[PDB]
Structures are given as structure tokens and as C-alpha cells.
Symmetry: C2
Subunit: 414 residues, 2 copies
């Protein structure tokens, strides 16, 4: 009802598991709450300049605004936070991008971000983290981090299965656990909240399959399965076991020395990709202490959330970290920072995150020249120290730029 | 049967929730697997020199070796990894210390560390993290970190309640969840492992009560409740709500501005202690980016594991991080690093962790002068750059010391 389909423009289709992208594709975008009003226009302008320059006017995106969050309640009414129409429109047009979203508190509504991921079965949360020269960073050697996180995006405790302390449902679950399952390790069964952590073999193998195919297609050096399997043996530990099994079953993984690491030969470059694993708390230490030993990471949902955020902080990229939520049919690229309502509408926010998520979107569309121009633009603008306040306030000798002006600096550096 | 109770020596008793420590207390110690054979003798020698110097021969610990891990199977037989006797001996003597422990794989045995915590109801895992001048660190300003982690140690997914994919028990639980509880969010119910995450009100309030009493007794500035409550509303979110409730109910917490932070007046110094909260993935960023804003941390079991490890890595203290597991009746202090079997028996390992855990033990015993001498000794030895290989290999101008020699350097610096 309130979305306007572009007059000129054509739908991306999926044929034989490969995207068929017209020269004039219609792309849905969600503005986002808070600073989405600042960073989305800068992203639209930057992507259009990269597309214009790369293909000399032969290609152009027909942007189509669709709605989720606050703007959805203002477009569609009172408690329309995620209209059914928005899910149908991402499904129909296949590839979409969104600014930051916040979920309201007090109404029993679960994460709108997670609802989009789960309902569109976007089981890969893909977070590439590398350092942009010139970025103010808290660590001494941020340039040693160049990692790509494949975070499982459909299962784990992150899935929202739980019951409130003292509710009839939590008491019913606890009674089943103690009485029927013989659980003796709930320390205090009264006034006790209960959450369920699921992790399946199929969910594990499609995420690790995507991570190993990515290490092959991009000639990366290794895939590290990060898990807390010494405590959670049957969810985290099983993720790790199924990840190694998949590498053996489908990628001809061979044992290195006495194990447990495997080597997978890259079919195209002959490089031996190491498949290894690290327990998650030690891994949060290793990304700081030995960052150059890690590359592609495959992990479960909650650990992926933590790892991506800790890595983005260490390279100074908390406001420029790109992300994608990819499934087999659909894909939703996203700004990964918060809504920052304190500066919203002030044209101050860093648009770097949603712009690099748009670079990821263009590369997913096969438009790699336009994607390469955005990386080049971000490269040059940050290296030039012509940056937004969140960077400039941590450094000396930078030229402070508004959000819109930094979008211009990126175009200038293409 | 194979423990020898010291001839001279007396048992610590607990009277009116306060420890009554003799001048000649018997303290149980577990050597630990791997490098425990290196770091425990250095710790025994360092603690005895601090006790000798502080009290001029008037006090002395009667150390009594008790058994867990490999050495237990060598003392007591084949699959005696944690003899009942060891739990009775920690209960009887109240205060004990242990080197690193590893749990065997392949026999269905759950974490020996967690079994000690849970069976002795040591619901506080206390991890103080601060920077020792001279320590090689990956971050630019490690001296800004001075935090004290109160990690809930008896509940959460960390408690070991789970069933293996395709077992009759996991199928029975999944059938109950889908059929009786109406769960629709298990993406793939077949070949699916299941874990249970409990968090009670009583478990939450005794951990946050201990954290706020600690901020009072030590005149700390704030207590931050770290949680992932926007996704796990009824375990992590409820931990946060119960922590704020406790601060209001028992410590006269008053609202700061429009909330949610509270201020608790320190009864003894009049300082207004801020009670605040941060979502856990953002917190892993904040400890790097704004470390000086945090002080006492109260969090659940798994997040506490992650936070303590990430903080220890950032200050260069991965091998010198102290820890205690404290309950209302008993207390077990511990080396917090691994068993490092690659260098075990080589007198190479850093004894700093178990020595600082012994400083925590002496301070818990009311022997604060001897505890202060160990901190002073660690201070001076690390500042002097007379350190073990794990420090020296990351720096220039250090004098390399064996494990035993660094124990001597600490005594020399008292
Ligand atoms: O709670 P939040 O996560 O919405 O914001 C936390 C802090 O980070 C800032 N922030 C988040 N994204 C930003 C961006 N992209 N650019 C500049 N500042 C940003 C906010 O202004 C705020 O001060
Ligand atoms: O698997 P682990 O955790 O047992 O050890 C990992 C690595 O850290 C090292 N390590 C752990 N504790 C150490 C200590 N206290 N001193 C020196 N090295 C240590 C080990 O030697 C190993 O190389």
C-alpha cells in the first residue's frame, strides 16, 4: 500500500542458485531509526556515484524505500513495526539494505533485526573486519587484523526461546526438566528464568559450508571454528565437530600432523586452507594477541555477535563495520552500529558502516567494479584524515566533516 | 586416606559469617596439572616469605597437599579425577588454592573446575584485573583498566544442562518444547543439540549483593551490570533487573536523572557509587575504548568468562591474572591460565597468576600485610623487567628468568 515501485527498474531474479541482476535493478532500502536519516542519504549518493563511474551510465539502481521501525509506525500506523509487506518486498526483490533499527521496549516485541534474519532465513551473518589506514584505534597493531566472520544467524540462545521467572510456563518447563528429565543442576528452581539454546547439524553445516566456500573463492588462508565446546558439548562442541566433519566430507579435508586441524586444498589456487578451532574465551584473547593467525571465522550466533563487536572496536571501526545477512534466496545488508538518537538529524554520524555494507551488497550483486570504487573511496578519505567527529575527536590533524561531506570525500577518493 | 594432615597447624573456622584464622592455619593446596608442577612450588615459597616478613615469624601456614586432576589418578587410581575427600577437605579447612586443572576428553566427564565451584557453591568468581607497569600489552593504554569482575558462578548455560543431537533425551526435550510449550523457533528440530540456560533471582541477588558490598568495602566508583538482556530477556535481562532491584532494596539506591542508573551512598566514605548497566557485546567494545569508565562488574557466568579473559589479554596479564571462587562458607583461589603441557616441568611458566591468587587468599584470610607484600613484590619484579619468557619474548631489555627465579624476584621486591 505505501511503497512506490520504481517506474523504471527491473527485479533481480535467482536462477540456478545464481543471481541474475539487471542493469537497472530495483533495490529496497530501509532508512533506519535515529541516524539512519543521516547515513542512508549519504549511502544512496555514494553508491550511485560508484555505479555511475564504474559503468559509465550503463547501469543504475532504482532505489525503492520500504519500512521497518519508527518510520513504519509513522507510515502504516501505531504498532506496525515490521509490516508483512516489507518481508514480501525483500523476498520479491532479493537484495536490500537498511540503516540501524531499534526495537521498542515495554510491549513484548522481540528484536526487529533478528525477526528479519529469522523470517527471511538469512542464516549467514557476514562481518568482514579489517583496518583502514588512518583510523584511530585503541590497539598498537590494528593492521594485523583482517578477518571475515561467518556468524550462524538462525539458531543458538539468540533465537528468543525463553520463559519468565515465576510465569506458569517457566514453572512448567522447570517441572518437566527436574521431574521428567532428571535435571539436578538448576541451583535455584524458584523465581528462575529459563532459556533454550538449540544448535542443529543442518544449521551448522550450511554456515560452515558458506565459510569454506568463501575461503576458497577469496583465497583466504584458514577457517577457524570458534566455540565454547568444553562446557557446552552438545551445541557449541557439536558445532565444532560438525564443522570439521563437513570439511572432511565435502572439501576433502586431510589431517595435519596428529590433528585436530585439517587442510583443504583450494581447487583454484592450490593453497592449503587450514581448518582449525579455538575455544571462544581464549579466542577473544587471541584476536588481540595473535591477530595475524586468524582469517575466516565460523561460529554460532551469540559468540559471533561478541567476536564481530570486539574486532570492530580493536581496529577503530565500531562505526564503519559492514555487515550482511545472507541466506540461499535473499540478502539484507545493514549498518551494524546503533541508532545514536543523541545526534540523529544533525548530519554528524559516520556513514562508513552502511556504505561498506552497500559495497558488500554491490559485490554480492556481481557489480565488483562499483564495489571496488567504494572501498577505494573509503580508503582514501580515511587515509586523508577527512573524517566525521567520531574519528576526528580521537585524533590530531584531521579535517572534521559532516556525515554528508564524508560521503562526498568517499566519492572524491574513488 | 593419602592426604597428610599437618602435625602443627589449626583449622580456620567460620563464626558469624566471619573467618577465624589461627596464626598457624592449615591451608589445602592442589598442585595442578601441567605447569602446576612449576608454579605451585614458586607460590609456596613466595607466600611463606611474605608471611614470614609481614608477621616476623609469628604466623605460618601449614600447607597440606590435596588432590584433583592427573595427580589424583596417580594418587588414588584410574578414574579418580576428583575424590570426595578433596571436597570434604576444602569444606573442613575453608580456604584453599589450586594450580591449573584440565578435564579429560572422551570419558563423558564435565569440567573439574566447574564441578569444584558448583559442589562447594562458590557462587562468586572474582577476577580483579589491573595493569602492572612494565607488562608488555597489545593496547596503547592498559593502565586505564582497573576493574573487578564479579562473575556469577553457579548458574547460566555454563551449568552443564544439555542433551546430544539425536539422543532419546534431546528428542524427548524437543518434543516437549514443540508440542507442550508451543515452541516454533527451533529452525531445525532434527539432529539438534539442546542446552538449558537458567538464571534465578536468588542467584542474581547474592552475586550482585557481593559486588556492591565489595564496591563499598573498597571504595570503588561503580558497579556495572553487564548482560545481553535485549535478546535474552528472562535470564540476562532479569539478571539486570534483579541487580538494580537489589541496589534499591538493600543499599538505598536512588535514581540518577531520569534513570536507569542508580547511586548508592558509600556508608563509610560518603562516595556516591554509580550502579549502571551495559549490554555485553557493546561492553566488549567499551573495555577497549573507554576502560576508565568501568570499575566493579557484575555479570552472569558465560559473559564473566569472556569478559575476564578479554580484560586479562588487554593488560598483558593473560598469565598473571588472579582469581577466586568464593561462597558463603568456603573459598577456592586459583591459577586462571591453562596447564601449558608444552612447557610443564621446565621451570619456565609464569607463576604470577597463582601468586596473585595467593595474595587474594591471604587478603580473604585477613592477612592483608602479607597480601600487600606480594602485590609490592609483583610490582617491583615486573617493573624491573626481570620476568619469565612469556613476558620477555614480547619485549626488549628484559632479563629472562626461570619460573623459580621470578618467584625469587617477587620476594626480593617485597
Ligand atoms: O546507543 P547507540 O549504540 O545507539 O550509540 C552509542 C554511541 O555511539 C555513537 N554512534 C553510533 N553509531 C555512530 C555512527 N555511525 N557515527 C557516529 N556515532 C555513532 C552514538 O552517537 C552514541 O554516542
Ligand atoms: O592451552 P593452554 O591454555 O594450556 O596454553 C596455551 C599457551 O599459553 C601458554 N601458557 C599458559 N599459561 C602460561 C603461564 N602461566 N606461563 C607461561 N606460559 C603459559 C602455554 O605454554 C601455551 O603455549
Amino acid at each position: 500500500s505505501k511503497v512506490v515501485v520504481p517506474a523504471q527498474g527491473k527485479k533481480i531474479t535467482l536462477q540456478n542458485g545464481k543471481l541474475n541482476v539487471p542493469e537497472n535493478p530495483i533495490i529496497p532500502y530501509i532508512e533506519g531509526d535515529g541516524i539512519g536519516v543521516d547515513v542512508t542519504p549519504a549511502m544512496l549518493k555514494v553508491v550511485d556515484a560508484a555505479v555511475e563511474k564504474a559503468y559509465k551510465g550503463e547501469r543504475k539502481i532504482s532505489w525503492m524505500e520500504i519500512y521497518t521501525g519508527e518510520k513504519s509506525t509513522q507510515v502504516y500506523g501505531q504498532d506496525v513495526w515490521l509490516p508483512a509487506e516489507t518481508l514480501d518486498l525483500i523476498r520479491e526483490y532479493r537484495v536490500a539494505i537498511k540503516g540501524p533499527l531499534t526495537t521498542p521496549v515495554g510491549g513484548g516485541i522481540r528484536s526487529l533485526n533478528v525477526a528479519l534474519r529469522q523470517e527471511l532465513d538469512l542464516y549467514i551473518c557476514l562481518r568482514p573486519v579489517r583496518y583502514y589506514q588512518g583510523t584511530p584505534s585503541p590497539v598498537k597493531h590494528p593492521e594485523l587484523t583482517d578477518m571475515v566472520i561467518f556468524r550462524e544467524n538462525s539458531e543458538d540462545i539468540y533465537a528468543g526461546i525463553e520463559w519468565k521467572a515465576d510465569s506458569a510456563d517457566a514453572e512448567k518447563v522447570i517441572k518437566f526438566l527436574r521431574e521428567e528429565m532428571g535435571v539436578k543442576k538448576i541451583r535455584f528452581p524458584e523465581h528462575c528464568g529459563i532459556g533454550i539454546k538449540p544448535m542443529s547439524e543442518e544449521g551448522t553445516k550450511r554456515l560452515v559450508r558458506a565459510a569454506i566456500e568463501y575461503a576458497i573463492a577469496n583465497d583466504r588462508d584458514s577457517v577457524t571454528l570458534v566455540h565454547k565446546g568444553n562446557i557446552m558439548k552438545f551445541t557449541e562442541g557439536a558445532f565444532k565437530d560438525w564443522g570439521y566433519q563437513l570439511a572432511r566430507e565435502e572439501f576433502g579435508g586431510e589431517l595435519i600432523d596428529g590433528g585436530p586441524w585439517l587442510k583443504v586444498k583450494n581447487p583454484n589456487t592450490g593453497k592449503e586452507i587450514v581448518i582449525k578451532d579455538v575455544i571462544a574465551d581464549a579466542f577473544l584473547q587471541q584476536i588481540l594477541l595473535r591477530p595475524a593467525e586468524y582469517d575466516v571465522i565460523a561460529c554460532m550466533n551469540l559468540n559471533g555477535d561478541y567476536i564481530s563487536d570486539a574486532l570492530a572496536a580493536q581496529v577503530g571501526g565500531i562505526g564503519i563495520a559492514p555487515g550482511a545477512n545472507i541466506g540461499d534466496e535473499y540478502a539484507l545488508f545493514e549498518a551494524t552500529h546503533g541508532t545514536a538518537p543523541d545526534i540523529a538529524g544533525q548530519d554528524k554520524a559516520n556513514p562508513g558502516s552502511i556504505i561498506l555494507s552497500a559495497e558488500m551488497m554491490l559485490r554480492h550483486m556481481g557489480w565488483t567494479e562499483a564495489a571496488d570504487l567504494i572501498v577505494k573511496g573509503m580508503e582514501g578519505a580515511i587515509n586523508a584524515k577527512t573524517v566525521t567527529k567520531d574519528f576526528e575527536s580521537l585524533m590530531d590533524g584531521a579535517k572534521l566533516l559532516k556525515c554528508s561531506e564524508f560521503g562526498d570525500a568517499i566519492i572524491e577518493n574513488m
